[PDB]
Design a binder for this molecule. Structure first.
Ligand SMILES: [Zn+2]
Lengths: 113, 243, 97, 135, 246, 101, 42, 149
């Protein structure tokens, strides 16, 4: 399994959470909750709703440029399984999380000086 | 009296009570029941029970993961209910005289009586039910700080959701995870029973491999499994600098 | 005269009367049949229902379409602190039960 | 063999008898009006209903005049009523749509416009072969 | 070396199998008979992978590849991608792609040298095909069908196309591909060639319903078995074909 | 005013989205597919008068030039100028990306 | 269809109980009884 | 020539490339050395269907999908591969050259700590803020008296 993200607001979408809309052009829209789904059906722009990660990025209230944001990607070329690689990846995930947290706090203080 | 049980009796049951003080319940009075000892001879049963006097028995020394059990409980009470929800009858058409959530004919033929087979309004729910063939997915240990962690999800977390179980509290003891639903409601005493017969299905012989357990909040549309995850997603708050 | 269209009966007669239970704790009506060749064991336990949650299960069920796939299933959590054994009741067999 | 396919898990049926759905193939029909559902059981007052991957019997209300006088078998490929798959996903399409087939399941047309459901594509291999998008 | 087979009483072999010159992919079923057909023919010469794509069993019409690479659609899960990567050796490049037309077995048909695609694929998908598969890519329709992968079976030996493909289209497409082409059918007149069969340079598996004349046409065009060539069709087989398909 | 405002949010009353409108504006093949999805003889004005921005058919050239002065058309122009919300913007909002080699 | 009370269904279930589910439940009973005897003798 | 005859001529026609060239084929060498599988031979290869029949038949036999995994170390093929860790996807972070980027991140982090990126920083100001809070409280009390009267 995997953790998806809400199309509308950007929250983590876990299994059995939310609803998916399948459109006839071939695009699928995963929503984490009925709030996001109903706003989407009402044709509201997520970029103008201030509780969404889209608005927060467009307003510059999320840390968008950082070295720690380059480690997570949709890997479309699979890697042959390697136990050592997976354990060093888990250690990397912990260290990246800590460094990202401290840099985010610095970014917030520079916003709120 | 122990010798009398040894020489005259064919069925031996222990008396056992819950430790309700380890639960979040406001109730302080424990629940007591007779539990039958099966297997062995009657003398063996008597030594077994006498050796088990004043001792705590955990759930995993009676039941095991990948086993089907029976759950016996009293169901959710609904009070006095009409025939439409009590029996599932068809609603009469709109603006029917003297009521449409009713049965039109209750006694249209002989005898000159109302028959016991006719749907009538009355008490619905709070019935005793015995439901069978419920698979145990996990017997989690209360002293395990990651008893909701799996082999593919390495997040160290307990079974209790964020904010606790709604109207129950936190599960700090050993717990049983059962596929599906059970007859009772929250806070209610459940009786778990061994199956009376040998099973005939492959589902009873299947081995359960959990990949993930949801621990998001059930007080709303919870999207986070842990408070650390919630902090990591949200970022720094105003009260974080104020503190 | 006869009913023109057949329809099965609403509800089951195996659960009558539809009345409140006479006790709040569920009653074990039957225990498993005792085999003296098996080792000694307890046939029941008690717990308290805490609520429900969701899992993802890796399914090995040969023949099913969801074989070797992940399935999302609802589960019930029952909080089970250990019980304490404090007694012993003996039963004799009589022509009245 | 009757038209009901085997090995189908339970899903929500969004299209009862009397529903008009779109025609997703180039057979010439524009809509399909459902008159019956294959495999529908017997129940007093209950409308037979179909879901994605079911074969129904339908008449053509809009389309070529040669198609208007017959009862065609069709397979529902898209529905708008949300339903759950075994992986826990609740989902729906933006329209209800089906394709005309024969009783053995081969399509009357040659191409499918728009996506098809996984249930329809898995139960009917000809629809799988003529589907450009499977969702 | 043409073998008649069935996947759970279905004659559409190409829907449930993908066969190249370096690996075979078979849909996971409730039995091992469909895998065992390919296992009896390909006696461990190339790997056979039992795989699931997007939770479905239509992997043949959802996947496309050759002896150099494999392309899977965007709805493939990470564990399915990992299973494919662990099952295939490192000589084969596996990529998950973001093409809107996710039925890659319908929109892409390819051999080890060239590939034909549905005319509406994205440009980025076109260079991804040309990079991972290492082939040259052309946008083509076969007998006015845009689903070239389901309406054509292609190998390095030759190709079998839709039975209603005109002579001019056969010559143009044969000049484009560099292989001889024959317009023929499978499964008693089914024109879905790609869904009806899978073929590589030394083996073809067609449905059990496929008759002896069209099976012999397949063997001639794909050069399977001793003394098999496309020249036998219009010389030694012409009477049989005219008698059968008139 | 909106006709039958109670059932406006049903799936059977759904309108074309702004991202599809952007694709129709940038590429005529997408618009041609959307128009082949419809039947020209049942369209207002035989399909000859169509506003791509509003994704809407009109009965006459006078009617189309008429709606262009109205505020619904101008709100559609403003929303297209701002840009529709899409999956790549949604991915950038969380700082996620695609590694294609 | 054969009913749940059919004799052939009962015989099939009896063979399943004797040959398949029986040893599995026997081993599980041995493990559980060993644990609860460990508590009883403790 | 009628349409049906045109169709059968189209079926018998064999198209060929105009240049006369042919594509290189990639039949592996072991194909010639393969022996043909036949059922009557007592020395057959044991097939997957034979193993299934020996282990309960169809619907009972559980196939092992990890048996044919080609891995660097053969005892890794039955490992439980991690997928979720602390609300993140492991497969998103799987990168073959992870150690170089993690070393670069650590070098950047120590550089920033040296430069003072994470370095964190008046009684008169505190008194003036406290007096302002007192004034705001008095204003609230005045407004409450007005709302009462
Ligand atoms: Zn959301």
């Amino acid at each position: 399994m995997r953790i998806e993200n809400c199309f509308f607001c950007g929250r983590p979408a876990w299994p059995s959470k939310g609803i998916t809309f399948m459109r006839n052009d071939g695009k699928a829209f995963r929503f984490c909750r009925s709030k996001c789904h109903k706003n989407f059906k009402m044709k509201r722009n997520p970029r103008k709703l201030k509780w969404t990660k889209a608005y927060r990025k467009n307003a510059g209230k999320e840390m968008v440029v950082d070295s720690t944001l380059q480690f997570a990607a949709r890997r479309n070329v699979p890697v042959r399984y390697n136990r050592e690689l997976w354990q060093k990846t888990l250690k990397a995930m912990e260290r990246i999380s800590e460094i990202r947290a401290r840099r985010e706090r610095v970014f917030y203080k520079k916003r709120m000086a | 009296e122990l010798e009398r049980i040894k020489k005259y009796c064919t069925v031996v049951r222990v008396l056992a009570h819950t430790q309700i003080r380890k639960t979040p319940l406001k109730q302080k009075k424990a629940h007591l029941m007779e539990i039958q000892i099966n297997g062995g001879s009657v003398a063996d049963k008597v030594e077994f029970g006498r050796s088990l006097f004043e001792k705590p028995v955990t759930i995993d020394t009676i039941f095991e993961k990948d086993e089907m059990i029976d759950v016996i409980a009293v169901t959710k009470g609904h009070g006095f209910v009409g025939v439409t929800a009590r029996w599932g009858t068809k609603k009469l058409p709109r603006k029917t005289h003297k009521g449409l959530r009713k049965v039109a004919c209750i006694g249209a033929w002989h005898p000159s009586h109302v028959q016991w087979t006719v749907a009538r309004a009355g008490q619905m729910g709070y019935h005793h039910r015995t439901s069978v063939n419920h698979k145990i997915y996990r017997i989690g240990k209360g002293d395990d700080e990651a008893n909701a962690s799996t082999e593919t999800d390495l997040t160290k977390k307990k079974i209790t959701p964020m904010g606790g179980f709604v109207r129950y509290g936190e599960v700090n003891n050993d717990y049983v995870m059962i596929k599906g639903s059970v007859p009772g409601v929250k806070k209610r005493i459940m009786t778990l029973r061994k199956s009376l017969f040998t099973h005939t299905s492959r589902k009873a012989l299947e081995k359960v491999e959990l990949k993930w357990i949801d621990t998001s909040s059930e007080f709303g549309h919870g999207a986070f499994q842990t408070a650390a995850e919630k902090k990591q997603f949200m970022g720094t708050l105003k009260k974080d600098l104020q503190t | 005269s006869h009913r023109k269209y057949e329809a099965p009966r609403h509800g089951s007669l195996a659960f009558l009367p539809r009345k409140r239970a006479a006790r709040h704790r569920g009653r074990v009506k039957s225990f498993p049949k005792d085999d003296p060749k098996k080792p000694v064991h307890l046939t029941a336990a008690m717990g308290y229902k805490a609520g429900m949650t969701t899992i993802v299960r890796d399914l090995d069920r040969p023949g099913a379409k969801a074989h070797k796939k992940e399935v999302v299933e609802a589960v019930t959590i029952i909080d089970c602190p250990p019980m304490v054994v404090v007694g012993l009741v003996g039963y004799i067999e009589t022509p009245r039960g | 063999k009757r038209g009901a396919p085997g090995g189908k898990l339970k899903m929500t049926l969004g299209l009862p008898v009397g529903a008009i759905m779109n025609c997703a193939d180039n057979s010439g029909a524009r809509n399909l009006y459902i008159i019956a559902v294959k495999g529908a059981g017997a129940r007093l007052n209950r409308l037979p209903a179909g879901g994605v991957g079911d074969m129904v019997m339908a008449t053509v209300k809009k389309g070529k005049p040669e198609l208007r006088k017959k009862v065609h078998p069709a397979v529902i490929v898209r529905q708008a009523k949300p339903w759950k798959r075994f992986d826990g996903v609740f989902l729906y399409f933006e329209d209800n749509a089906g394709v005309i087939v024969n009783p053995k399941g081969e399509m009357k047309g040659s191409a499918i416009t728009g996506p098809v459901g996984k249930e329809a594509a898995e139960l009917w291999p000809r629809i799988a072969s003529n589907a450009g998008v499977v969702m | 070396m043409a073998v008649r087979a069935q996947f759970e009483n279905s004659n559409e072999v190409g829907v449930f199998a993908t066969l190249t010159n370096s690996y075979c992919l078979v849909a996971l079923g409730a039995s091992e008979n469909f895998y065992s057909v390919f296992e009896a023919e390909l006696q461990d010469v190339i790997p056979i992978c039992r795989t699931t794509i997007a939770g479905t069993r239509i992997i043949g019409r959802l996947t496309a590849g050759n002896r150099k690479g494999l392309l899977v659609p965007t709805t493939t899960t990470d564990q399915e991608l990992q299973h494919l990567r662990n099952s295939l050796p490192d000589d084969i490049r596996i990529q998950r792609i973001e093409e809107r037309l996710s039925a890659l077995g319908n929109v892409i048909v390819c051999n080890d040298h060239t590939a034909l695609i549905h005319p509406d694929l994205e440009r980025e998908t076109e260079e991804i095909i040309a990079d991972v598969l290492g082939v040259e890519v052309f946008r083509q329709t076969i007998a006015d069908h845009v689903l070239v992968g389901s309406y054509m079976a292609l190998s390095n030996q030759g190709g079998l196309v839709h039975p209603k493909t005109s002579i001019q289209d056969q010559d143009e497409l044969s000049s484009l591909l560099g292989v001889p082409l024959v317009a023929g059918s499978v499964n008693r007149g089914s024109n879905v060639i790609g869904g009806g069969m899978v073929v590589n340079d030394w083996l073809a598996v067609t449905g059990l319903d496929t008759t002896a004349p069209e099976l012999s046409v397949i063997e001639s065009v794909f050069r399977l078995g001793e003394g098999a060539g496309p020249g036998a069709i219009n010389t030694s087989m012409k009477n049989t074909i005219v008698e059968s398909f008139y | 005013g909106v006709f039958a405002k109670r059932t406006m949010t049903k799936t059977r009353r759904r309108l074309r989205d702004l991202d599809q409108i952007e694709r129709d504006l940038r590429s005529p093949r997408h618009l041609q597919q959307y128009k082949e999805t419809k039947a020209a003889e049942d369209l207002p004005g035989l399909g000859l008068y169509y506003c791509i921005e509003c994704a809407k058919w009109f009965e006459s050239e006078t009617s189309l030039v008429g709606h262009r002065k109205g505020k619904p058309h101008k709100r559609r122009l403003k929303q297209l100028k701002e840009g529709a919300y899409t999956h790549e913007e949604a991915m950038a909002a969380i700082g996620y990306r695609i590694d294609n080699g | 269809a054969k009913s749940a009370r059919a004799s052939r269904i009962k015989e099939n279930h009896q063979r399943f109980k004797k040959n398949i589910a029986g040893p599995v439940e026997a081993a599980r009973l041995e493990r559980l009884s060993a644990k609860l005897m460990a508590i009883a003798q403790a | 020539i009628g349409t049906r005859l045109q169709e059968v001529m189209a079926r018998i026609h064999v198209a060929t490339p105009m240049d006369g060239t042919t594509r290189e084929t990639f039949i592996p060498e072991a194909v010639k050395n393969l022996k043909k599988y036949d059922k009557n031979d007592p020395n057959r290869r044991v097939l997957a269907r034979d193993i299934e029949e020996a282990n309960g038949g169809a619907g009972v036999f559980n196939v092992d999908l990890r048996k044919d995994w080609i891995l660097e170390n053969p005892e890794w093929k039955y490992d439980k591969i991690p997928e979720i860790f602390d609300g993140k996807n492991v497969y998103d972070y799987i990168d073959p050259d992870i150690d170089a980027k993690l070393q670069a991140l650590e070098e950047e982090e120590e550089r920033l700590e040296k430069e003072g990126f994470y370095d964190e920083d008046d009684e008169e100001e505190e008194e003036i803020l406290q007096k302002a809070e007192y004034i705001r409280e008095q204003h609230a009390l005045i407004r409450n008296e007005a709302k009462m009267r």
